[PDB]
Amino acid sequence: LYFQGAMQVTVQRKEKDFQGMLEYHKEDEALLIRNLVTDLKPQMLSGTVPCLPAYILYMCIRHADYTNDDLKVHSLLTSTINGIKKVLKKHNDDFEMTSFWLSNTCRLLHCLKQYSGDEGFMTQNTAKQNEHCLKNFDLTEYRQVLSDLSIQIYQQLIKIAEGVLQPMIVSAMLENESIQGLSNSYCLEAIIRQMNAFHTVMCDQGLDPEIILQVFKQLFYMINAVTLNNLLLRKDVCSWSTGMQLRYNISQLEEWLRGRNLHQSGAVQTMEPLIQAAQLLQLKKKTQEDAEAICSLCTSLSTQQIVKILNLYTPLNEFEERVTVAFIRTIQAQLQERNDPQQLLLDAKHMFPVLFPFNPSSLTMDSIHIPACLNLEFLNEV
Amino acid sequence: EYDYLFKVVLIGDSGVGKSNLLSRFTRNEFNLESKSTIGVEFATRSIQVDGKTIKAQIWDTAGQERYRAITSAYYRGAVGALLVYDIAKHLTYENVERWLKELRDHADSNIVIMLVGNKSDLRHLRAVPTDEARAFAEKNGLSFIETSALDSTNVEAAFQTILTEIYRIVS
Ligand SMILES: Nc1nc2c(ncn2[C@@H]2O[C@H](COP(=O)(O)OP(=O)(O)O)[C@@H](O)[C@H]2O)c(=O)[nH]1
Ligand code: BEF
Ligand SMILES: [Mg+2]
């Protein structure tokens, strides 16, 4: 006695509300990577929550985890990471695109943590959020790959921003008298406008604020080194007048920081060498007392740097005098206990190691819906 | 942007509270552990006067001789000055004469000058009676106010008053 399956009996699916998952057919995967990564321009996403691409990706992963489909998990992620890399090799000079994928890569990482299933990443979840966690798969290894990617992307973001700022620094900081009583060019306003633009991009795209703070710490470090290094080569800018101008310039940068709530980034602190050089230029340089004041004050300048500036120092009125050899020797004797670097110039390309925060959010996957403009109609809600 | 830019110098002995008058005025901050000013330092703030935008460019200077700029010639172009002493230290007030003489040796003759007795919160420690400092101001053609960067009393008023008086002279 037999039974083929016959009202031909069929397995029907349970009808439930939006779980906040996103299923797709393996055959349609390149269209997905193509419309969600490769061909997605940051500006299409104006008017939605930041990092919707990362949430959407976690929602797809979630479903894949739920159907127990580890081929889908591996495929999707491996393919997404390659898509992003490919977009960044193509747009290797585009600050906006680079920051876009930094932001989204980081949020996708947060999602994989926040919904890992590890209770240590979940302390801040709501019950509803806790039920959007991965059930079957532990994706630790992919989290590691994503962390490596974000570092590579962050480095490309700094490279791009430094490339734009470089040709501006010396001219703006040293070759533009903008205040009274002291006697391709850029002004300081143009550096500040360029930094506004970077900042606005990073904000509009929901980059972690800890990352933003680090970006500007890093760029201020660059201004410090590039300006200081040029000054360590030139007599024509080592005068009290430049000292004051430079200090003023630095204070405008500092006020800019405060205005953007960036003052706790560490950026100010990275300028201490240039600030001390500016002060050194202004100070008296003749007596024993003068030399002691200089040695006490210039704790962030090496001996070689202090000596270079004193050697370069050039009065602008004949009514003032060049620093004497005896004065320099007095400085040299006083700075003996020091252990300074061998190289006169600062390394302007020095990179501070980035610390990426973990910032879980209160977005609920089951309230998230794809905007039609992404042309992902072939995705289906579960 | 702005319609007028007014360079204003802050001068007077070390410790009297110049840098804190400045931080209070420009961002409503006061710090008990203020570092001594080296050379000349700067902050700006814009205000409205007669419905016009006045950018105050404030030159904050060292009061300690070992921290001062080689030369006072930077006073040039200044339209205003605050000459600050500490009401709780008569010596800082005695030194106002010397600060004032130097200022007038290097500054333009239309400069507006305000004598400022700072730290008025230290009433229990007062060494300079108000009437004395006011008669000095009067006799020397200085305007006069007592301020406290600590509790903020008259700080806004000191700067608003000098900037407004400058606006009347130059507009
Ligand atoms: N009690 C009191 N202390 C003040 C006031 N203004 C400044 N100080 C303090 O006086 C000290 C020197 O202040 P600072 O602004 O650095 O003096 P500066 O050398 O004139 O610039 C610091 O410990 C202050 O916080 C004030 O109005 N009242
Ligand atoms: F800044 Be003060 F005059 F020490
Ligand atoms: Mg000061």
- The Cα–Cα gap between A317 and B70 comes to 12
Beta strands in chain A (DSSP E): 22-23, 380-381
Note whether A312 and A235 are within 8 A (CB).
yes
B115: containing domain: 1-171
- The Cα–Cα gap between A222 and A193 comes to 17
- The Cα–Cα gap between B153 and B171 comes to 29
In A, which residues are within 8 Å of B57 by CB distance? 179
* A278 phi, psi to nearest 5 deg: -60, -40
Burial B6-34 (b: 16+ CB within 10 A, else e): bbbbbbbbeebbbbbbbbbbbeeebeeee
State both tokens at B112: 């507006």
What crossing angle do the helices spanning A303-312 and A209-231 adopt, rounded to 10°?
Answer: 50
Give the nearest partner residue to B76 out of A181, A248, A293, using CB atoms: A181
Please work out, in degrees rounded to the nearest 5, the angle formed at the alpha carbon of residue B169 by the alpha carbons of B164 and B171: 85
Block residue for tokens 């700080």: B155
- Chain A interface includes B77 (CB < 8 A): yes
From the CA of B65, the nearest ligand is 2
Burial B111-129 (b: 16+ CB within 10 A, else e): bbbbbbbbbbbeeeebebe
In chain B, how many domains are there?
A: 1
In sequence order, which residues have a C-beta less than 8 Å from that of residue B97 and are 6 or more positions away? Answer: none
B76 with A255: Cβ contact below 8 A: no
Note whether A299 and A276 are within 8 A (CB).
yes
- The Cα–Cα gap between A314 and B167 comes to 38
In sequence order, which residues have a C-beta less than 8 Å from that of residue B17 and are 6 or more positions away? Answer: B84, B86, B118, B119, B149
Cβ atoms within 10 A of the Cβ of A206, count?
19
Cβ atoms within 10 A of the Cβ of A199, count?
17
- The Cα–Cα gap between A147 and B58 comes to 47
Rg (CA), chain B: 15
Distance A297 CA to ligand 3 centre (A): 15
Cβ atoms within 10 A of the Cβ of A362, count?
8
| Parallel/antiparallel/unpaired status of strands B40-49 and B112-118 | unpaired
Following CA atoms A155, A158, A163, A166 in sequence, which dihedral angle do they give, to the nearest 10 degrees?
A: -130
Task: Give the residues across from B61 on adjacent strands.
Answer: B40
Q: Which chain B residue shows the shortest CA-CA distance from A253?
A: B43
Q: Establish, for the pair of chains A and B, how many residue pairs have beta carbons separated by less than 8 Å.
A: 57
For residue A5, the surrounding DSSP H or E stretch is none
Residues 260-299 (A) with a CB less than 8 A from some CB of B = 278-279, 282-285, 289-290, 293, 297
In A, which residues are within 8 Å of B66 by CB distance? 289-290, 293
- The Cα–Cα gap between A344 and A360 comes to 45
- The Cα–Cα gap between A115 and A121 comes to 8
- The Cα–Cα gap between A195 and A43 comes to 20
CATH number at residue B68: 3.40.50.300
Nearest residue (by CA) to ligand 1, atom 13, is: B17
Note whether A137 and A65 are within 8 A (CB).
yes
Cβ atoms within 10 A of the Cβ of A216, count?
24
What crossing angle do the helices spanning A240-259 and A272-282 adopt, rounded to 10°?
Answer: 150
Please work out, in degrees rounded to the nearest 5, the angle formed at the alpha carbon of residue B5 by the alpha carbons of B3 and B7: 165
Resolution of the structure in the document, Å: 2.2
Cβ atoms within 10 A of the Cβ of B132, count?
12
Length of chain B as a residue count: 171
Q: Which technique was the structure solved with, according to the deposited record? A: X-ray
| Residue B72: burial class (beta carbons within 10 Å; 0-12, 13-18, 19+) | middle
- The Cα–Cα gap between A286 and A327 comes to 6
Give the nearest partner residue to B74 out of A181, A284, A320, using CB atoms: A181
- The Cα–Cα gap between A137 and A45 comes to 30
Selection from B155, B148, B154 nearest residue B16 by Cα = B148
Please work out, in degrees rounded to the nearest 5, the angle formed at the alpha carbon of residue B40 by the alpha carbons of A246 and B10: 140
In sequence order, which residues have a C-beta less than 8 Å from that of residue B139 and are 6 or more positions away? Answer: none
Note whether B73 and A181 are within 8 A (CB).
yes
Note whether B161 and B143 are within 8 A (CB).
yes
3-state secondary structure chain B: CCCEEEEEEEECCCCCCHHHHHHHHHHCCCCCCCCCCCCEEEEEEEEEECCEEEEEEEEEECCCHHHCCCCHHHHCCCCEEEEEEECCCHHHHHCHHHHHHHHHHHCCCCCEEEEEEECCCCHHHCCCCHHHHHHHHHHCCCEEEECCCCCCCCHHHHHHHHHHHHHHHHC
DSSP-derived 3-state class of residue A23: strand
Distance A108 CA to ligand 1 centre (A): 50
B148 is known to lie in a ligand binding site: no
